[PDB]
């Protein structure tokens, strides 16, 4: 369940 966005 990836998050390729900035955090």
């Amino acid at each position, epitope marked *: 369940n*990836p998050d390729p966005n900035a955090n």
Partner: antibody
Amino acid sequence: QVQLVESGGGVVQPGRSLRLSCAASGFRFSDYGMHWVRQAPGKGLEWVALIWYDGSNESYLDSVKGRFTISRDNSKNTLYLQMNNLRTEDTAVYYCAKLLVGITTDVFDVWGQGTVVTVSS
Amino acid sequence: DIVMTQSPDSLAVSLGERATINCRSSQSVLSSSNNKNYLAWYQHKPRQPPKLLIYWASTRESGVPDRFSGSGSGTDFTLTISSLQAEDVAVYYCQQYYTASPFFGGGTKVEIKR
């Protein structure tokens, strides 16, 4: 406006290379993963590639892996698709798009207008 | 891979009548960490880019009229158009955005039945 503007499509011979560009404006491009999606004649939408917000990882459709490279230059708010060893079945309208992988709040998508790539001799 | 399958491939609906489009994912797209389904619906007309209709399986995007609604959870999802308008003729796609390879379904072409 939040927008993406694509350029670089055209006619290209089989086996040759072509680079697409996608110029982003009106939003914080460098905060988001970004994608290419394509639609071949008579076919449905097909996701092609994903690049992390900071360029640190990429994901590819199996049929383009090793031939296509997704990259970005955040200093220019630009996304690229380098297409090498092109094949007839890569003929399509190519879209860049934000899509929704990893969304949390303040959700939006944005797509470019598309650019046509025709692989033909 | 989480692969997306839609049914039917084409649908003819009379003006003003209900349209139902189904979508199945090969694995669950429900996240155990936030209890949300990573499932979107898109509308696509010729000569323009796709438009987002629904995300989180049932959250209707700003500007989308309330005749569009999404339902389902886990692996089984439905898009309903409660009363078809002529401007709703289009190809509709489900898509999962759970993984780093966020596949679209094959699309369902919705036309007017006459």
